[PDB]
């Protein structure tokens, strides 16, 4: 009753038909059916084939004439590692059926097309570590998680490959449009929030659980998300992996879910070795202060998740989308620029979009290096805002930017070089600006 998005069955077009195993054996049947678990596979750990119909693993004997067998997954006695490169010429030579490359069955995709993927448990006694596929539990094996022992009908598996000796195990992560049983769920936001307190994971790693859950890890995007988020925390002593890294190398700061960098909250002497040391966490220590830390360290890890045109202008200014947009050449402070803009019926330039980024970088900037945008800290430092108070709905900045929110009280945003990036100044530098209005209908 639980979906196989990674079984498949494997076809012969030699000998025109389907991997089937019965009896002991492994043979080929000209009539292939989908439905039949006899020819139905899965790649599992340890370069190990699966076969449904049997539950046990394709082998074939150690270096004594070859052939091929269906064991328990257990078995040291036979050689059940498979490399899906090679595995179709193998069945060739060891299924002695004398007539052809092998494929998954009615895609005609090659045997590598599903390979095994690590799935990291959530709570439980093992620190999140991946589900071991296979794993006996009361002496049935198991391809994958399973309800079974367990009357609250959570999907689990274990991350020992025998659970009755090392009693290990784990939740399986389940991709839901609600936050029932293992989130915590902000009633303001709805959005909902995950801590695993007890898992010991690397930042790609974290990444990965919370992926498998539909979620992301963390992003703290406004002042009420980071009290709402050290409320949670109240009573722990942790560090906690976010979603905070400058990973991407032609990019700065950034959430992983691709929220817009618009609040911070690092440490006073945060972020420090820039080379290494490229993922953010969350310390309990400063309450809710953050760092960067080298992103292969095994830390607990907090996950996220939400279940949520023609115009024209006056002489000078160009249109986009509805709006009016032109440059201004005089160099003046930030604050002046705005001054500018305002005696103009515009404002300092918002942007929204990466297509307006783009007219912006494009058809307005143009030749000129660097000039002054909407986006500052002003009203409340550390927290970016556009000076037209439309809402930031995304950051582009360059790499290590922005560095200037600590050391310059009142925090500026430019636009520098071809690629329409972005830095942060202090206000009082002297720079072009662009300008943005409401355009007119036709
Ligand atoms: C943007 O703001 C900066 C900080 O407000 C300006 O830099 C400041 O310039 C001041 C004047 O040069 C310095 O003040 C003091 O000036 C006397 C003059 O005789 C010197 O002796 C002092 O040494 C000097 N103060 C110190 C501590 O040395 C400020 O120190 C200096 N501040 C910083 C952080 O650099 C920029 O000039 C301003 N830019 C523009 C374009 O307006
Ligand atoms: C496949 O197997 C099922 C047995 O559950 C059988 O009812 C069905 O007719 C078979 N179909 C084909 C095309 O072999
Ligand atoms: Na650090
Ligand atoms: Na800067």
Same mark, same amino acid.
């Given at each position: 009753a639980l979906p196989e998005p990674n079984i498949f069955l494997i076809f012969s077009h030699g000998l025109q038909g389907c991997l089937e195993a019965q009896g002991g054996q492994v043979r080929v049947t000209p009539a292939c059916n989908t439905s039949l678990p006899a020819q139905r596979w899965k790649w599992v750990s340890?370069?190990?084939?699966?076969?449904?119909?049997?539950?046990?693993?394709?082998?074939?004997?150690?270096?004594?004439?070859?052939?091929?067998?269906?064991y328990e997954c257990d078995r040291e006695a036979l050689n059940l590692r498979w490399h899906c490169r090679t595995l179709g010429d193998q069945?060739?030579?060891?299924?002695?059926?004398?007539?052809?490359?092998?494929?998954?069955?009615?895609?005609?995709?090659?045997?590598?097309?599903?390979?095994?993927?690590?799935?990291?448990?959530?709570?439980?006694?093992?620190?999140?570590?991946?589900?071991?596929?296979?794993?006996?539990?009361?002496?049935?094996?198991?391809?994958?998680?399973?309800?079974?022992?367990?009357?609250?009908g959570h999907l689990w598996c274990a991350t020992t490959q025998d659970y009755g000796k090392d009693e290990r195990w784990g939740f399986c992560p389940i991709?839901?449009?609600?936050?029932?049983?293992?989130?915590?769920?902000?009633?303001?936001?709805?959005?909902?929030?995950?801590?695993?307190?007890?898992?010991? &994971?690397?930042?790609?790693?974290?990444? *990965?659980?919370? $992926?498998?859950?539909?979620?992301?890890?963390?992003?703290?995007? !406004?002042?009420?998300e980071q009290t709402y988020i050290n409320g949670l925390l109240t009573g722990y002593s942790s560090t906690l992996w976010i979603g905070l890294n400058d990973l991407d190398t032609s990019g700065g700061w950034q959430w992983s879910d691709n929220s817009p960098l618009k609040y911070l909250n690092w440490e006073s002497d945060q972020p420090?070795?820039?080379?290494?040391?490229?993922?953010?966490?969350?310390?309990?220590?400063?309450?809710?202060?953050?760092?960067?830390?080298?992103?292969?360290?095994?830390?607990?890890?907090?996950?996220?998740?939400?279940?949520?045109?023609?115009?024209?202008?006056?002489?000078?200014?160009?249109?986009?989308?509805?709006?009016?947009?032109?440059?201004?050449?005089?160099?003046?402070?930030?604050?002046?620029?705005?001054?500018?803009?305002?005696?103009?019926?515009?404002? &300092?330039?918002?942007?929204?979009?990466? *297509?307006?980024? $783009?007219?912006?970088?494009?058809?307005?900037?143009?030749?000129? !290096?660097?000039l002054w945008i909407g986006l500052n800290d002003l009203k409340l430092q550390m927290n970016f805002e556009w000076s037209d108070g439309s809402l930031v709905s995304f950051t582009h900045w360059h790499p290590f930017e922005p560095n200037n929110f600590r050391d310059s009280l009142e925090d500026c945003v430019t636009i520098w070089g071809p690629e329409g990036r972005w830095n942060d100044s202090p206000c009082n530098q002297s720079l072009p600006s662009i300008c943005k209005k409401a355009g007119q209908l036709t």
């Open positions: 340890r370069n190990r084939l699966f076969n449904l119909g049997t539950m046990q693993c394709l082998g074939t004997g150690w270096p004594t004439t070859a052939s091929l067998g269906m069945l060739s030579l060891l299924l002695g059926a004398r007539t052809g490359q092998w494929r998954i069955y009615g895609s005609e995709e090659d045997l590598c097309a599903l390979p095994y993927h690590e799935v990291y448990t959530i709570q439980g006694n093992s620190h999140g570590k991946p589900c071991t596929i296979p794993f006996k539990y009361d002496n049935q094996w198991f391809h994958g998680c399973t309800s079974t022992g367990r009357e609250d991709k839901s449009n609600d936050c029932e049983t293992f989130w915590d769920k902000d009633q303001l936001t709805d959005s909902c929030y995950q801590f695993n307190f007890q898992s010991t &994971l690397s930042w790609r790693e974290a990444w *990965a659980s919370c $992926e498998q859950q539909g979620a992301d890890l963390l992003s703290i995007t !406004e002042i009420h420090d070795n820039p080379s290494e040391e490229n993922c953010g966490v969350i310390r309990t220590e400063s309450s809710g202060g953050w760092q960067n830390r080298d992103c292969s360290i095994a830390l607990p890890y907090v996950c996220k998740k939400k279940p949520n045109v023609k115009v024209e202008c006056e002489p000078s200014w160009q249109p986009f989308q509805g709006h009016c947009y032109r440059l201004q050449a005089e160099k003046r402070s930030w604050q002046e620029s705005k001054k500018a803009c305002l005696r103009g019926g515009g404002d &300092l330039v918002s942007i929204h979009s990466m *297509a307006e980024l $783009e007219f912006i970088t494009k058809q307005i900037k143009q030749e000129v !290096e660097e």
